[PDB]
Design a protein around this ligand. Structure first.
Ligand SMILES: Nc1ncnc2c1ncn2[C@@H]1O[C@H](COP(=O)(O)OP(=O)(O)OP(=O)(O)O)[C@@H](O)[C@H]1O
Ligand SMILES: [Mg+2]
Lengths: 572, 583
């Protein structure tokens, strides 16, 4: 239960509304017990008085109490729910946005530790599970504790033995039964949290892989795995249902015992008189009514094992410290960028071999560099070091003769343009897929950059307003390839990193793109990763990598004459 | 909102409950037994209370009524325990069967139709919206009989005692259902927009999570927090709108419940004193009559307050059914599931006659296609990017709908059984994905019981075994989310190992050697060239100089095949291929 402390500390926000809901929950209960307690005594007092005692009996005041308690019961409960549910879902809104804000700082390596469908389960489903903590643990428990004391103290004036017999049963139930239901349901609650997030991960993975699973006949055996998780999840759901049913049955028997004891015990005497008379109905109808205050009490702790399990999931995600940290100092973005690497080494998390081993290159401002190498030789790992995806181990990287780790994050993103090897098409509109880079661009600039990159057919019909991605239109592989080039051309950064930008493009389209890049990327430092040794004459320097090292480095003409690894790439 | 649509969703919801019809009737019977036992309990307390208070009977003389009162209490706790478990069991059987229907259709839908929603919105549809139907089946359906029979049985027990008390309860009931229907007319639409905002918030989150790398590249952290804040704020406001309707209806029904309890208490209290004389059968109003009506007054409205509470569970299921019913209605790739199948495992022949390939939204992807690929022959698709080359391969996989003719061995593709057709299919796709946990589980996707010799042959041919020593666990190394453990060219060769592991009647290759350098493209193409000769093959590629032995070359432009023939004829004859080859 120590994991709920950070989330009970969100009561400080909206503390006036959350404490107002507690007060109105107490007042609602007091009026609810009083309505049935006054009617039980009023009927018995009136019956005993009879016609003869009409003038001696003050019947107007009880008639006002039952009327007054009727509105207070219905008005209090309505308003208690309004204020408590309003504040609760404002707390859950802030908790959700706060939990989402932790993801991008963890993006390259921290997010790889989790599955994407489980991360989705935490931010939407596990945050929503914590509504139990703000709606139905604090208000029911302190509402029932105050009402029991008010009932016990109030009845103590009439008789001490009867008050503590009813009060003792209620107080013993309040302090002994909910902890019993917490232990009986915490293991189920942990499974219930685990199995819902495992089902959502398996379902999203199963859905996002249906192109491959269907063709290779693995959909059924991956649906069987998913359908087995639902069997376990439904079994845990049924286990919690039996606990609720047992809780309700037991609450009916404890309340029965209080009524039975009050009937038997108060009959002998109430306050020392042989014939209590109407005071018997006072205690019997108090026991019959006061046990409505303990109804939500047992379920407050029974569902806490699932709330604690969820709160651990959110806390784990928000307690992650990002591996890469940026200075808060404000820096000016330079118009010319020349980067320097001296013996850069990098090892991936949970790995033994180095992806980069002593990479060293000096790229002057305005130079265009082509990087060549085998598959899996660290070409993409190099371009991601330059983006501060990871901090290098036993190396140093400098931009304009200043360390790359000393740049403000806003300045680092304004000085580097990247075309990733895998292009993500977001599920927004076409305009928003291009407003990632240069948010202030107009539709005239967005439309023109699409014409240059060859995506003019994408401007037809809805055009910029057309919805792209999931729930909309997929672009082809080439159209995605050209959409990423359009993004990087809009960013307009001094340093441009291109990871195989002309990939999956036909010969004519590639020529048009390479012609466009050559024009737009003038007086820009460009590191272009290619698997195609075409138009390498233009590049002022060619880098050939192998197993995370720069094997040979020189101009296109020099690399052919010496007939190194590059020459074999060209012809062979 | 439309009431006609809502009336159609309630019919669909009510049909799913037939499987649990026995359990729903048992809870109706058990809920009536609870009404009987609460009348008996109120009668025993009133008889005991009347004897002690008015006749001063010692508690020892009253032992049979205590014995029966305790017995009634024990029986009532047993029925409540039974009824909760019966109702839950009915609800999850219906939920399990509804989710099976949804997942059954998602299998037949394929990747093209799964594209219709963000993957996070599919999860809301399957998890949140099917699970929120429970209280409709478990609670609301049994309650309709209990909302009529239980209050009626309460009243019948009070006419023989006091006819004025039974009219106070019946005088307040008729406004209960009118106010129930008045508050809840907009509850089904408020729930529909609540699930709409939850699916939008869930689909938006998983989309930005999968593109978190592109967001970090461009520094969209502040912008994406606001986009979540907007989607989260909308969901919070739709949730509130659902809740204030359930609080208002609950409060209004509590007002009448409390008004009647006060009215019964005041009527009997004044009747005992003699303030008013009506309401009794020429006999003094006994104290047992007052206690019986007082205990049973809250229980007269319980079945009616529960019906109002479960009327909003019904509205929650109707708003949850709106999105499910739409999915279960939209036609799939082919209107009728094919039953025909082809027996021979020999390479198939493909014929297309005025073939049109369209999206799920009806937009044509490839124009009139007329070609023929004889059995065992291999064809090459080349052309400009965005000319619909990949759409033809997706239509051959059975993923897209087509309007013309597309015959496999003379049998229309839509008439083929999709599961049996896919056993004669193998392909490497554009930007391939690795769904299995490890590298070995991915290569063995086609059949996980392959021999170690067959597995090693695929890894050797696909040039995968060269980077195996780099991986820590070797072939058992997990690949991670979207194969994050592998480089792009390494995941490309793992997808080539899938295609080359089982024999097939037709092999499709979208971009088999993508993201491979000059040398590794040669070794991978050595395996794919030999594999393309073993059966009918349709490869899409941008490489042109490398291919000269392929039987026929198809060039598309704007979704239409415009040249056919071998490399020798097309290279020197001009046209678009020579222009394509010129660069
Ligand atoms: N997340 C990761 N964890 C561990 N190792 C990784 C990870 N991503 C890549 N690697 C490994 O790092 C090495 C270099 O990977 P990198 O992505 O830099 O290759 P690359 O040269 O870009 O390849 P390609 O040309 O195929 O795109 C390979 O052994 C690769 O499998
Ligand atoms: Mg790479």
């Amino acid at each position: 239960m120590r994991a709920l402390l950070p989330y009970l500390a969100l009561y400080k926000r909206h503390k006036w509304m959350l404490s107002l809901g507690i007060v109105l929950a107490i007042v609602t209960l007091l009026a609810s017990i009083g309505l049935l307690t006054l009617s039980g005594w009023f009927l018995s007092a009136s019956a005993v008085a009879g016609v003869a005692g009409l003038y001696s009996f003050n019947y107007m005041l009880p008639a006002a109490g039952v009327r007054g308690a009727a509105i207070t019961r219905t008005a209090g409960r309505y308003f208690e729910r309004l204020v408590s549910h309003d504040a609760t879902f404002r707390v859950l809104q802030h908790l959700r946005i706060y939990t989402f804000s932790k993801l991008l700082p963890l993006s390259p390596a921290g997010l790889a530790r989790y599955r994407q469908g489980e991360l989705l389960n935490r931010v939407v489903a596990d945050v929503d599970t914590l509504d139990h903590l703000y709606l139905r643990v604090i208000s029911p428990l302190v509402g029932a504790f105050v009402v029991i004391m008010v009932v016990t103290i109030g009845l103590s004036f009439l008789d001490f033995t009867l008050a503590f017999t009813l009060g003792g049963i209620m107080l013993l139930t309040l302090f002994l039964m909910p902890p019993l239901f917490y232990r009986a349901g915490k293991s189920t609650g942990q499974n219930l949290t685990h199995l819902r997030g495992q089902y959502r991960q398996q379902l999203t993975a199963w859905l996002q892989g249906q192109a491959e699973l269907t063709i290779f006949g693995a959909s059924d055996r991956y649906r069987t795995q998913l359908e087995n998780t639902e069997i376990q999840w439904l079994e845990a759901q049924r286990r919690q249902s039996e606990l609720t049913a047992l809780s309700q049955a037991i609450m009916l028997l404890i309340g029965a015992l209080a009524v039975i004891l009050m009937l038997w015990m108060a009959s002998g005497g109430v306050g020392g008189n042989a014939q209590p008379g109407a005071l018997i109905a006072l205690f019997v109808f108090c026991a019959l009514a006061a046990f409505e205050a303990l109804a939500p009490v047992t379920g407050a702790f029974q569902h806490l094992g699932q709330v604690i399990a969820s709160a651990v999931r959110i806390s784990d995600l928000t307690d992650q410290k990002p591996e890469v940290t940026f200075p808060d100092t404000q820096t000016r973005v330079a118009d010319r960028v020349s980067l320097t690497l001296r013996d850069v080494q990098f090892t991936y998390p949970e790995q033994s071999q180095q992806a980069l081993k002593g990479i060293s290159l000096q790229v002057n401002a305005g130079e265009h560099i082509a990087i060549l190498g085998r598959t899996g030789c660290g070409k993409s790992t190099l371009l991601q070091q330059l983006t501060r995806a990871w901090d290098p181990q036993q190396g140093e990287i400098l931009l304009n003769d200043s360390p790359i780790a000393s740049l403000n994050e806003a300045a680092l993103r304004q000085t580097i343009s990247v075309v990733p090897q895998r292009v993500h098409l977001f599920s927004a509109t076409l305009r928003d897929n291009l407003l990632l880079a240069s948010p202030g661009s107009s539709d005239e600039a967005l439309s023109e950059i699409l014409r240059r990159v060859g995506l003019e057919k994408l401007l037809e019909d809805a055009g910029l307003n057309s919805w792209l991605g999931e729930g909309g239109r997929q672009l082809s592989g080439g159209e995605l390839r050209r959409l990423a080039i359009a993004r990087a051309l809009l960013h307009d950064a001094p340093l441009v990193l291109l990871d195989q930008p002309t990939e999956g493009l036909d010969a004519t389209t590639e020529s048009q793109i390479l012609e466009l890049l050559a024009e737009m990327m003038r007086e820009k430092t460009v590191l272009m990763v290619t698997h195609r040794l075409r138009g390498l004459s233009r590049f002022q320097q060619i880098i050939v990598m192998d197993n995370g090292q720069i094997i040979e480095q020189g101009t296109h003409a020099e690399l052919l004459a010496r007939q190194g690894r590059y020459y074999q790439f060209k012809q062979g | 909102m439309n009431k006609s649509r809502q009336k159609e969703l309630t019919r669909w919801l009510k049909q799913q409950s037939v499987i649990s019809q026995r359990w729903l009737n048992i809870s109706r019977l058990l809920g009536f037994v609870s009404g009987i036992l609460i009348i008996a309990q109120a009668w025993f307390m009133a008889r005991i209370l009347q004897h002690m208070i008015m006749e001063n009977i010692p508690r020892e003389a009253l032992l049979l009524p205590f014995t029966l009162l305790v017995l009634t209490f024990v029986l009532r706790a047993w029925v409540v325990w039974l009824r909760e478990r019966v109702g839950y069991h009915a609800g999850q059987h219906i939920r399990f069967a509804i989710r099976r229907q949804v997942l059954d259709r998602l299998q037949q839908a394929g990747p093209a139709w799964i594209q219709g929603k963000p993957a996070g919105s599919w999860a809301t549809l399957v998890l949140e919206q099917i699970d929120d139907m429970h209280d409709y089946y478990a609670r609301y359906l049994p309650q309709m009989a209990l909302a009529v029979s239980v209050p009626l049985l309460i009243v019948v027990a009070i006419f023989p005692s006091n006819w004025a008390a039974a009219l106070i309860l019946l005088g307040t009931a008729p406004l209960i259902p009118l106010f129930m229907a008045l508050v809840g007319m907009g509850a089904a639409d408020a729930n529909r927009r609540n699930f709409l905002a939850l699916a939008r918030l869930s689909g938006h989150f998983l989309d930005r999570l999968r593109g978190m790398e592109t967001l970090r590249i461009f520094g969209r952290g502040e912008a994406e927090i606001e986009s979540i804040r907007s989607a989260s704020e909308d969901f919070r406001q739709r949730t509130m709108e659902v809740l204030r309707l359930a609080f208002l209806s609950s409060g209004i029904l509590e007002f009448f419940t409390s008004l009647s309890i006060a009215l019964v208490a005041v009527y009997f209290g004044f009747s005992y004193l003699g303030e008013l004389d009506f309401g009794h059968y020429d006999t003094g109003v006994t104290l047992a009559a007052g206690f019986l009506a007082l205990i049973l007054a809250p229980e007269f409205f319980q079945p009616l307050r529960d019906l109002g509470t479960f009327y909003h569970a019904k509205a929650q299921a109707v708003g949850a059914a709106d999105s499910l019913k739409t999915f279960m209605e939209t036609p799939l790739a082919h209107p009728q599931r094919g039953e025909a199948e082809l027996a021979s495992t020999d390479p198939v022949t493909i014929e297309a006659e005025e073939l049109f390939i369209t999206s799920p939204e009806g937009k044509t992807l490839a124009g009139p296609l007329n070609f023929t690929l004889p059995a065992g022959q291999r064809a090459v698709l080349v052309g400009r990017s965005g000319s619909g080359k990949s759409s033809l391969l997706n239509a051959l996989s059975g993923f897209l709908s087509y309007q013309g003719s597309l015959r496999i061995n003379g049998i229309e593709l839509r008439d083929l059984s999709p599961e049996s057709w896919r056993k004669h299919l193998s392909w490497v796709g554009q930007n391939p994905q690795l769904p299995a946990a490890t590298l070995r589980d991915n290569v063995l996707l086609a059949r996980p019981d392959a021999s170690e010799q067959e597995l090693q042959a695929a890894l050797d041919n696909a040039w995968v075994s060269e980077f195996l020593p780099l991986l820590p666990q070797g072939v058992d190394t997990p690949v991670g989310d979207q194969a994050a453990r592998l480089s792009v060219g390494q995941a490309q060769r793992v997808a080539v190992a899938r295609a080359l592991l089982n024999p097939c009647s037709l092999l499709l290759l979208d971009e088999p050697a993508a993201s491979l350098d000059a040398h590794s493209e040669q070794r991978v193409m050595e395996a794919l060239n030999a594999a393309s000769l073993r059966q009918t093959t349709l490869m899409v590629t941008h490489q042109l100089e490398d291919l000269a032995d392929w039987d026929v070359i198809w060039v598309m432009q704007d979704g239409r095949i415009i040249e056919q023939g071998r490399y020798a004829e097309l290279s020197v004859a001009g046209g678009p291929f020579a222009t394509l080859l010129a660069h």
